[PDB]
């Protein structure tokens, strides 16, 4: 229920936390380089996500724009953010267990490590330089690395059938981050944790 969101990047990020229809805790906060933000998530939260936003501008009421991960121009996110966005996904207290993962299905903007701060399971990590190695057709002009579905809107990339396979692009994401979801029907890299665990999301976990 406790998530410490740490920004080890050299640049300011704007952390966001939402379960799709509502904000988790405040829903969003500015994180300068090195700052930590502890948030509390309801037990039993299904389908929550934490991500980082890049190059944000907000007014005095918390309205503005982010060049990655914008959630309707809000500082305190109540909706999911705009791709490209590296996703820390979690479902808490699901029949006794927690389930965590990192997803590149909505693209990649900032590296992250998603680890438990309590005993019982391992962490996941996507820290490679996906933005620097991004294929030309996927690069967001000011947003990092898009996913194939965001760029091309085809059944194969978006898995609207529910019977899809890997591509060039998913395979690039999976080559740079094997621990993260590259496409929808990817072999699950989901980690099972003891119910009611606590976690740390670290942006730019490495150098």
Author numbering: 1 to 207
Show sentences the authors wrote.
The helium path was used for collection of anomalous diffraction data at 5 keV for two proteins: thaumatin and the membrane protein TehA. Although anomalous signals from each individual crystal are very weak, robust anomalous signals are obtained from data assembled from micrometre-sized crystals. The thaumatin structure was determined from 15 microcrystals and the TehA structure from 18 microcrystals. These results demonstrate the usefulness of a helium environment in support of native-SAD phasing at 5 keV.
Thaumatin consists of 207 residues, including 1 me­thio­nine and 16 cysteines forming 8 di­sulfide bridges. The calculated Bijvoet difference ratio is 2.8% at 5 keV. We collected a total of 17 datasets with the helium path, each from a single crystal. Individually, none of them showed significant anomalous signals. We performed native-SAD phasing for the 15-crystal dataset. With an E min cutoff at 1.3 and resolution cutoff at 3.9 Å, we obtained a substructure solution including 9 sulfur peaks from as few as 80 SHELXD trials with the highest CCall and CCweak of 48.6 and 28.7%, respectively [Fig. 3(a)]. BUCCANEER was able to build 206 out of 207 residues automatically. The refined structure has an R/R free of 0.19/0.23, indicating high quality [Fig. 3(c)].
